[PDB]
Short mmCIF file of C-alpha atoms and ligand atoms in Angstrom, two decimals:
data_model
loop_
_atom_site.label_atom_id
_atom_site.label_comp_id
_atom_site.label_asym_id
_atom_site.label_seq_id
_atom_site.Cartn_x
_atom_site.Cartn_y
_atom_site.Cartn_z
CA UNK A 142 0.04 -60.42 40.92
CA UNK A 143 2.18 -60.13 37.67
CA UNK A 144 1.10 -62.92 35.32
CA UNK A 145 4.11 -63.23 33.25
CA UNK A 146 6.21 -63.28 36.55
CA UNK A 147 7.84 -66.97 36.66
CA UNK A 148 10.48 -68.52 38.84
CA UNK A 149 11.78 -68.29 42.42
CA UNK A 150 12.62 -64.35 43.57
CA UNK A 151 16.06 -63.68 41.56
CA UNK A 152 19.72 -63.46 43.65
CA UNK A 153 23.14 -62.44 42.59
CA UNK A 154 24.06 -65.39 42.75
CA UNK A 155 20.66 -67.39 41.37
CA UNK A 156 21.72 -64.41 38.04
CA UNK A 157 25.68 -65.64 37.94
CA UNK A 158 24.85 -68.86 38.24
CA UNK A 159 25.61 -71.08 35.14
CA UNK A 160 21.76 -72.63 35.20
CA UNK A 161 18.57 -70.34 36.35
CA UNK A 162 15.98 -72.34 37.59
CA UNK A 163 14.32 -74.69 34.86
CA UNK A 164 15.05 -77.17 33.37
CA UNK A 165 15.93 -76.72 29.73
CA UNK A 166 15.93 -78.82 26.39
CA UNK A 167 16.09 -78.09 22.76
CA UNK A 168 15.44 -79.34 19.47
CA UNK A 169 16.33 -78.09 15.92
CA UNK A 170 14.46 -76.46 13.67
CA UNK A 171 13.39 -79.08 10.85
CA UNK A 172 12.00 -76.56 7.97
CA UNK A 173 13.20 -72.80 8.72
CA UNK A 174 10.96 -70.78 7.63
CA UNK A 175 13.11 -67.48 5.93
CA UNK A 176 16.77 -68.34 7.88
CA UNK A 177 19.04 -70.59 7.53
CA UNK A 178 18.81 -72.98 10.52
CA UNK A 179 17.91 -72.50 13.88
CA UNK A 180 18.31 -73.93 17.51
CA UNK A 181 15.23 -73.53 20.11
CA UNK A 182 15.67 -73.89 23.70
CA UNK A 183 13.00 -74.25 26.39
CA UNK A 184 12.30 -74.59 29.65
CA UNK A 185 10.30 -77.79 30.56
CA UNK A 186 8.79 -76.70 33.92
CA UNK A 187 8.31 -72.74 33.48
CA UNK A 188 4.76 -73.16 35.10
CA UNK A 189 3.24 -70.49 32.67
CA UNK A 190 3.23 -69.45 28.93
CA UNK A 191 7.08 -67.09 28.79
CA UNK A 192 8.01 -65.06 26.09
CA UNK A 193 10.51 -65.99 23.40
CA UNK A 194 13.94 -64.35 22.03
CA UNK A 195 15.90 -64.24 18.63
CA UNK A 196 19.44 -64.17 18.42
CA UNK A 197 21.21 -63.84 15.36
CA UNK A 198 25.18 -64.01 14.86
CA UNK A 199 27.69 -61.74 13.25
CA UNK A 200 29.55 -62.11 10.11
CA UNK A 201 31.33 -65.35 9.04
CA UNK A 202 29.65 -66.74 12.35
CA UNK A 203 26.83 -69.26 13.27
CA UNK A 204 25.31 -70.47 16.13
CA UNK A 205 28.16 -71.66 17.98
CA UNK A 206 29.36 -68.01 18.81
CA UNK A 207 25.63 -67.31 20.35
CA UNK A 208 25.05 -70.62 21.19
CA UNK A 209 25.11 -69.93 25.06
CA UNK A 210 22.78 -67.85 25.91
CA UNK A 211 20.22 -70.33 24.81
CA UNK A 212 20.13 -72.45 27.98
CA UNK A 213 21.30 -69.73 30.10
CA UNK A 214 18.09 -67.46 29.37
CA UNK A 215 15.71 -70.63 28.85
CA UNK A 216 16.89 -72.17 31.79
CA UNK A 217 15.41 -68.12 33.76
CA UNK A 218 11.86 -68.55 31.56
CA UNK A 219 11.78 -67.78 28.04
CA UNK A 220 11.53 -70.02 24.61
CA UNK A 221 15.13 -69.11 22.78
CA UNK A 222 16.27 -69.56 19.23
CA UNK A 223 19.33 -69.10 18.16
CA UNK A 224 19.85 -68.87 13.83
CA UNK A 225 21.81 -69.19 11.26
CA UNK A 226 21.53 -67.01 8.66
CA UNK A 227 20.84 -67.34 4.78
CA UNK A 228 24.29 -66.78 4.10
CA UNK A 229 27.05 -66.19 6.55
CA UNK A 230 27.56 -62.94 4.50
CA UNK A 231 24.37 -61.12 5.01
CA UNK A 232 24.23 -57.81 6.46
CA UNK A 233 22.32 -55.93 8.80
CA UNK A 234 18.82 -54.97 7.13
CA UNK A 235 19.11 -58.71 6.37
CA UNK A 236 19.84 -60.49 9.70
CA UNK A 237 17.12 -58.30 10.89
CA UNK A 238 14.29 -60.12 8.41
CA UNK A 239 15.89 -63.77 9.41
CA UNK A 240 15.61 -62.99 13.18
CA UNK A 241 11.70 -61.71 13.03
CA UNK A 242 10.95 -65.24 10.51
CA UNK A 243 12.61 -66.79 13.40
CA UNK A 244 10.11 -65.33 15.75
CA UNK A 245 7.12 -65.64 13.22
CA UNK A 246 8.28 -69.55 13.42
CA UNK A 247 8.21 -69.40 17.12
CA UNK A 248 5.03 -68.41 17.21
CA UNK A 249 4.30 -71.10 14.63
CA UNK A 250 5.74 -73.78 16.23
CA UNK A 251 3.57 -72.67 19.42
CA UNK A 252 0.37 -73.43 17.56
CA UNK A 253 1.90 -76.80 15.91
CA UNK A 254 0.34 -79.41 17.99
CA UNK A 255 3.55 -81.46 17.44
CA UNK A 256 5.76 -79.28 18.23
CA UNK A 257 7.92 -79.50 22.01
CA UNK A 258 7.17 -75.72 22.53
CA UNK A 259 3.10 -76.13 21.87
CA UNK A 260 1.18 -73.84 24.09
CA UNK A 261 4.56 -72.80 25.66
CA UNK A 262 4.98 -69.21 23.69
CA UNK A 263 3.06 -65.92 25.03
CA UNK A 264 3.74 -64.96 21.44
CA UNK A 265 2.59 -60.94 22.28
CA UNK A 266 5.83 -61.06 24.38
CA UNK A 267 9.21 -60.65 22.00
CA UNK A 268 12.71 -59.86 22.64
CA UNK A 269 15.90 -59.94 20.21
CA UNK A 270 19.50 -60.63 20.26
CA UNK A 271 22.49 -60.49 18.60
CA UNK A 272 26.69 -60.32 17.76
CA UNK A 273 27.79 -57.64 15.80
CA UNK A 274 25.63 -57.36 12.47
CA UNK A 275 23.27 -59.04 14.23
CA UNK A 276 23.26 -56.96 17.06
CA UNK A 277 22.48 -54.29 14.65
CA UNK A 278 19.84 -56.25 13.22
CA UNK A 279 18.26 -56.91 16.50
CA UNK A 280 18.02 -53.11 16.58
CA UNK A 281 16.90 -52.74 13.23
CA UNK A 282 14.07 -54.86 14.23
CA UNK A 283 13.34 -52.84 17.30
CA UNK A 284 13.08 -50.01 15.41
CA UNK A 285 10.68 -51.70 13.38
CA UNK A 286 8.96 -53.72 15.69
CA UNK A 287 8.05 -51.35 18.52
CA UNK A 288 6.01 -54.22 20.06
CA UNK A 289 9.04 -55.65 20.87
CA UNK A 290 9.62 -55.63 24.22
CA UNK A 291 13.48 -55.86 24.52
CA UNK A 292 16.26 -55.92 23.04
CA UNK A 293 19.80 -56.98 24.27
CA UNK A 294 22.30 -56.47 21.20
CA UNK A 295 25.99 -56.78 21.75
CA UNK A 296 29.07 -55.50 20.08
CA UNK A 297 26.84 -53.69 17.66
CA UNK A 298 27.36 -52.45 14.37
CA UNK A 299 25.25 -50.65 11.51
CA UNK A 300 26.19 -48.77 8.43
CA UNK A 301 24.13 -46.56 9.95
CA UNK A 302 24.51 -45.47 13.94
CA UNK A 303 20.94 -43.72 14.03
CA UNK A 304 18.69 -45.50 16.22
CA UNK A 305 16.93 -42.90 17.48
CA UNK A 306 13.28 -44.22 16.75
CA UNK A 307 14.18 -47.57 18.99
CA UNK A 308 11.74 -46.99 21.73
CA UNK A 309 12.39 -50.80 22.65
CA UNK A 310 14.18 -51.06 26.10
CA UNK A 311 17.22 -52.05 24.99
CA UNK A 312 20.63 -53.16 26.54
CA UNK A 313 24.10 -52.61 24.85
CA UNK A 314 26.77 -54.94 25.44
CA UNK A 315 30.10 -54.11 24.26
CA UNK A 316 33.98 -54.82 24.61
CA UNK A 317 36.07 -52.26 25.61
CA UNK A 318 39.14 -53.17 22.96
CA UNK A 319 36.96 -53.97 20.13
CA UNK A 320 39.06 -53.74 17.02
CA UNK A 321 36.39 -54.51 14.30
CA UNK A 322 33.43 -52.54 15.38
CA UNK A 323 35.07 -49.78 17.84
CA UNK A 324 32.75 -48.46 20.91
CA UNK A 325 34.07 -45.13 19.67
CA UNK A 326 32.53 -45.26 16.40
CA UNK A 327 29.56 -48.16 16.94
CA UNK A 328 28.11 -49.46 20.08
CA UNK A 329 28.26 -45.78 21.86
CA UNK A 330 27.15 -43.88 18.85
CA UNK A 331 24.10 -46.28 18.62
CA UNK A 332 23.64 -45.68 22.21
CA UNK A 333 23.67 -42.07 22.33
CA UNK A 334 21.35 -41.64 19.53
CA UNK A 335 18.51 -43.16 21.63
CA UNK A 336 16.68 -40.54 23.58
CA UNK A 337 12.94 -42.51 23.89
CA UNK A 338 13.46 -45.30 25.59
CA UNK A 339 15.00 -47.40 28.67
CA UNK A 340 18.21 -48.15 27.50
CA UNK A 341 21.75 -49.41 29.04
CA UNK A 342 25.34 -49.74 28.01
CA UNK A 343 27.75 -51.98 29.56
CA UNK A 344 31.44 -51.78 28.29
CA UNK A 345 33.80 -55.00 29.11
CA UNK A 346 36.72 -54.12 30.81
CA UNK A 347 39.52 -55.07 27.94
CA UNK A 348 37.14 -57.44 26.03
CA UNK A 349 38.20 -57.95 22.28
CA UNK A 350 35.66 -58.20 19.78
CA UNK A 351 33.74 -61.88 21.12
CA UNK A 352 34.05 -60.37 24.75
CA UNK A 353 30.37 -61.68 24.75
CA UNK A 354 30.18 -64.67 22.89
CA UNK A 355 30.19 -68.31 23.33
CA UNK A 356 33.13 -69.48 25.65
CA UNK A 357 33.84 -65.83 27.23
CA UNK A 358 35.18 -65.61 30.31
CA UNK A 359 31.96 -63.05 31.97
CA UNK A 360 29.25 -65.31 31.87
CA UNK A 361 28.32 -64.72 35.62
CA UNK A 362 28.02 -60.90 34.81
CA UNK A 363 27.11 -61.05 31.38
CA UNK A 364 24.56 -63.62 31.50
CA UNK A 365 23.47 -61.65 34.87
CA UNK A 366 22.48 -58.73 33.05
CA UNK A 367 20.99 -60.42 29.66
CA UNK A 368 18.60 -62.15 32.20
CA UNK A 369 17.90 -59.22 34.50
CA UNK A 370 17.36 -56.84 31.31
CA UNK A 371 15.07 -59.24 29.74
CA UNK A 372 13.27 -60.46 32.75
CA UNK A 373 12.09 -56.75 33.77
CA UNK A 374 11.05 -55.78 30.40
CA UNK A 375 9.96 -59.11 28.51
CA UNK A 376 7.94 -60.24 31.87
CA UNK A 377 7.40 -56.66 33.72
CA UNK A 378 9.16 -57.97 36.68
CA UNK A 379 10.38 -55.33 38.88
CA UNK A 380 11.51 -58.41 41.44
CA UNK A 381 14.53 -57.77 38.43
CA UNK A 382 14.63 -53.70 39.01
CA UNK A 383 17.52 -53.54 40.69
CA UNK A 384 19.70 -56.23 38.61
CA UNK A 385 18.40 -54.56 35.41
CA UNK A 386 19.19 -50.94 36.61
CA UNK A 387 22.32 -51.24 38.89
CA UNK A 388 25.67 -49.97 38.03
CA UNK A 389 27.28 -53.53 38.67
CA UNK A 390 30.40 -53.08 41.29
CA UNK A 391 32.59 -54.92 39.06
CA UNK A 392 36.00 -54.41 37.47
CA UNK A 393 34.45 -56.20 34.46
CA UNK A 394 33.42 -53.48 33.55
CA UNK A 395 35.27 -50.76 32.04
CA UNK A 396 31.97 -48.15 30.96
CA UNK A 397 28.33 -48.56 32.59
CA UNK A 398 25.86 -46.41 31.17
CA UNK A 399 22.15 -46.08 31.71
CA UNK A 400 18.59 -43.96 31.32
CA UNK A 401 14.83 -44.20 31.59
CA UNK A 402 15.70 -47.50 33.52
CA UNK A 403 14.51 -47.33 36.96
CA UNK A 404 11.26 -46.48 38.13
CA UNK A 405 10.32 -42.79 39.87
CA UNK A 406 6.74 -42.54 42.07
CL1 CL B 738 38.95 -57.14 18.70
NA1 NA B 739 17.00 -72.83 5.00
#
């Protein structure tokens, strides 16, 4: 009955799996439009119009440290892109601009008769990403964009740790020994300070600072979650209620925290 609901009825092990169920290509983006460069991925056989998701990298870093997550989510139902930035140096406030042009392209390049994603976007569904600075731009733009209809940040950091207009359901991955941007002082401070909305916090067990980037060694749980989070918000699909919600019985994971997730009668 749900009409963004797409793909076979969601396992463990259909979540951990390397591939979800469509097939995915990707080409890059010839003119970006207010970023640097960008990647899109998308599925081929999604059988209905999915919702796309920005994800922007951290400092020094480019799309090779996000650079999985494209196929893994496009390959569950949703148009990906993947940036570089303007300059490897920007901050925050900044990544946050880049990752909504990215998504104004998307939504460009769905009306661009040329284009491999033509008719493929339900642009009025949006979700963001990020590593670092641009996991706190992903939440900048939340805050911003209240439309937005996830976001799934990880290893955050802000100058700022007040996010406490964010009423975007919103997932925070982070790595338990993070040296540069410490849970202590950045991805559970952001966390705490957001009392309006569905929200979740899920703390590798030992993970240094890329505990979540390309080439990690918790793509089964990490990519798991990512598509469970963004499949019951992005699509409404409560198929993914209990992946989304669950406390995962893992020693992955170090710190599991959640609120406003599941549902109550
Ligand atoms: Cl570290
Ligand atoms: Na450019």
């Amino acid at each position: 009955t749900n009409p963004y609901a797409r793909g076979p009825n969601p396992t463990a092990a259909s979540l951990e799996a390397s591939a979800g169920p469509f097939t995915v290509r990707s080409f890059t983006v010839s003119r970006p439009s207010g970023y640097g460069a960008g990647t899109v991925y998308y599925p081929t056989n999604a059988g209905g119009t999915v919702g796309a998701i920005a994800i922007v990298p951290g400092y020094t870093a480019r799309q090779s440290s996000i650079k999985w997550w494209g196929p893994r989510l496009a390959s569950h139902g949703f148009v990906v892109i993947t940036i570089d930035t303007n300059s490897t140096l920007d901050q925050p406030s900044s990544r946050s601009s880049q990752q909504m042009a990215a998504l104004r392209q998307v939504a460009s390049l769905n009306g661009t008769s040329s284009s491999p994603i033509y008719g493929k976007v339900d642009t009025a569904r949006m979700g963001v990403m990020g590593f670092s600075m641009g996991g706190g731009g992903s939440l900048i733009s939340a805050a911003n964009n209240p439309s937005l209809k996830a976001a799934a940040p990880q290893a955050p950091w802000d100058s700022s740790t007040n996010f406490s207009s964010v009423t975007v359901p919103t997932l925070i991955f982070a790595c338990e020994n993070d040296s540069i941007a410490p849970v202590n002082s950045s991805a559970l401070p952001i966390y705490d300070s957001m009392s309006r909305n569905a929200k979740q916090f899920l703390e590798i067990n030992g993970g240094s600072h890329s505990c979540a980037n390309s080439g990690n060694s918790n793509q089964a749980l990490i990519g798991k979650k990512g598509v469970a989070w963004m499949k019951r918000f992005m699509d409404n699909d409560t198929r993914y209620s209990t992946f989304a919600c669950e406390n995962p019985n893992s020693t992955r994971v170090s710190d599991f925290r959640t609120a406003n997730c599941s549902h109550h009668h």
